[PDB]
Design a protein around this nucleic acid. Sequence first.
DNA 1: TCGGTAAGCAGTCCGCG
DNA 2: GCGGACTGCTTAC
Length: 903
Amino acid sequence: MKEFYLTVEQIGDSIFERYIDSNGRERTREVEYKPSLFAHCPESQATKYFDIYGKPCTRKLFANMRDASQWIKRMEDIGLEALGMDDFKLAYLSDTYNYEIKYDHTKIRVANFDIEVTSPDGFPEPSQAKHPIDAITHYDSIDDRFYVFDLLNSPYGNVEEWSIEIAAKLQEQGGDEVPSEIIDKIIYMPFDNEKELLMEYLNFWQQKTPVILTGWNVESFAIPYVYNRIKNIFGESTAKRLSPHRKTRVKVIENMYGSREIITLFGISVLDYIDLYKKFSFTNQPSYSLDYISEFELNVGKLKYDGPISKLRESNHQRYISYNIIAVYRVLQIDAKRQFINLSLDMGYYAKIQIQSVFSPIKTWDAIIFNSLKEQNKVIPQGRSHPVQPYPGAFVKEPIPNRYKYVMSFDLTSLYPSIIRQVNISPETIAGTFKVAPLHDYINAVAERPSDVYSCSPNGMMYYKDRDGVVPTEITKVFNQRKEHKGYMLAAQRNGEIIKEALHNPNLSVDEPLDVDYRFDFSDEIKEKIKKLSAKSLNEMLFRAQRTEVAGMTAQINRKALINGLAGALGNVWFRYYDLRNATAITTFGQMALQWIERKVNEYLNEVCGTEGEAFVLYGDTDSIYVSADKIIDKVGESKFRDTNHWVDFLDKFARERMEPAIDRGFREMCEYMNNKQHLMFMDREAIAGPPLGSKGIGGFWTGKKRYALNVWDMEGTRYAEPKLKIMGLETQKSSTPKAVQKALKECIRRMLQEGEESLQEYFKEFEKEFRQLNYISIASVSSANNIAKYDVGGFPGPKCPFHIRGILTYNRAIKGNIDAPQVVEGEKVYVLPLREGNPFGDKCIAWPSGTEITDLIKDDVLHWMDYTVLLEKTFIKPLEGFTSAAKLDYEKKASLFDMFDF
DNA sequence: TCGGTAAGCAGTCCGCG
DNA sequence: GCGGACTGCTTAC
Ligand SMILES: Nc1ccn([C@H]2C[C@H](O)[C@@H](COP(=O)(O)OP(=O)(O)OP(=O)(O)O)O2)c(=O)n1
Ligand SMILES: [Ca+2]
Ligand SMILES: [Ca+2]
Ligand SMILES: [Ca+2]
Ligand SMILES: [Ca+2]
């Protein structure tokens, strides 16, 4: 098999590499790597090395990496460019693996673990590690086993062994319900003292050394705790055995009260699953506890236990250990669904970087572009300092706030990467400039054609048409990958709806789910077989289809993020190819494209509808247009349609057969105007929106920029079994809006869009009467708590103190003297509740860590003094008033002359 | 050697016989 | 008690 790396580190003048060899065995080597860098030399000498602009360079081969570094500094002091890859481990990887990496994941040791630490005096701080580690569960992906290290004797209590038999039982039968599919995979190891547990864990670690180390919050808790605990007991040298190269780096975090640490373990790639989740999931959660995310991702119940966690080991050691095991499994379950570890491996090996560098789009692209150019014997430019400069971005149309009955949307495929490829924007393809006219002059095609020789953007930049650029070349590769995966995702989504449609008439049979690949649209034969399946098999197929859809979502959306990341990278000062001329060539072209096509669509639709000067395009943002389809529907007349699906088909056909070719014609003309390399402005129909036929639903509404709702029947070729709400920007979409309020506002919207004013008024009235009966967490607001210290003045709010920080300070004073009340963590999220005047907390609001119940001592008072009136007004009524006034609708029946009767 | 912009809304401060 | 000029947070893209 072809060899591939696992980890790589630079340690002084040595590269330390863990790798898989040709026989599939894990090995480690130390290499005294001799790096090369480059300097410009005169033309009149035979070299094979050229910079990206075609200028000749001479190679400088160094005896060691220090020498190469020191030479860089001398060149800066002389004032001459030092070219080549300055991150030597990237050069080493590029030299060692000069081919496309084909890795075997079954050879990569992926470890996830979590520890328990009983603490009788508040949160057990990793920097101090003053309490015994009393449990560790460590799952190893090669053994496919959960290794459980359990402390029986502790200064905080002596306990009996954990029982696997009791663990497997239903919670309703006094067990812990450890999932049956992992019972046989547990290897249980009890210990009579902490020293023996830790030594054995260390010996175990040596035998089974993680390559990928993950888990929930491992970077900020488990790793530094294990490290500092071992250090305090045995010494730092022993603690360094957690590094296969015996090298660590300790970073102390600042704040003011309660410093933290991050430990870098050399030769290990730490991918904290919380960080993977935040980067790759595209959610913003009100809480990031494992309980909350697990419920969200897997629909599994919260792991219940009685009393404080500080007393869980002594009162119920059995459950304590079981919950430790289940928590490790939950992360594995989330990963089986989300596939972020797979993505990280995919992306890291593609780029030829340390696996943990997938967090950095800049490092990722630097390495991709470096490897690409090196293949051509080209030499990369030195990184340079730039002052941070703001620059212009996308165009967003101001919508007229209103209801909009029939809406069709259209969207440009992968816009910024497509602009890069169309225009041929790259550091080395810059051909020159032209004198810019006002943007509106290009949009209206009155400005002089920029060039008849070069490919242009309306920012004034010209690029070569007949030359490949490394940025377009490499961005096209990842785009093509993205396209493949999004195809699988959309197919799986279409397949899902087939199953949902078949679930309306399930068969009374004992059968099995069909063995199919959900990444491809079902054949007619499969659809016929599905129409004859039982509910049980249909439901199993739907789960499978949806899992396939999620897998494809992960793969496509993050490849999209990577390629869009390259366009933004050009505007980040730390990027080797930072260049506002290029960043701005992209965004300005985007602005022109949206507004050009707005004009062309208004022109086309007026023509075909036989009118003049009417505005069909009601809104647009960056690369999308929203077209009012009322007059298209009216020209045929509403009465002609048999049902909702009839007019949806009509609009779908109209869009594909008439609008799209006209849109294509328009963008082809734009491409000729800018004399671009390749026409890649592909704008396809996205949503078809409207009320159900014969209903009083309003179909849709906008309140302003980035704030709208639509009743959608078809999305990107997925005809929904049931209409789906597309809500952007409104409070229903915001993580700061209370849970029960998002639900209530969404139902208010569903009613407005599908049913009408009366239905809305009926629901509002019910919700208002029941508001005060909702659970307090479900109606609490949420906010991130940044810069808490700044506004803290002897425990009281300083000037300009934000509402949520004021709430934290109120909580801080309320839990003063308390031992085991959870502290608010800087940068994390809090629930927030308003408090009535006169309350014993002494201030207008309280805030506490999100995803948690508020501590039992003050919970009673919070419930008593909660200001329901303010809460209802601020979180529910005020946004609803925004939606309804925009929609020319009332959520409460207005007084009228009719009030004299009854009725 | 750590490494995108546009834009809406809640809230504080302050002006306001 | 409600605006305008800020900060802060959050979402659309
Ligand atoms: N997180 C994001 C989202 C968008 N944008 C920019 C780049 C996109 O090209 C453009 C349009 O956003 P879209 O959400 O429509 O995404 P794309 O057009 O790139 O992809 P597609 O429409 O094919 O899904 O806005 C960005 O820089 N970063
Ligand atoms: Ca725990
Ligand atoms: Ca798009
Ligand atoms: Ca059937
Ligand atoms: Ca879009």
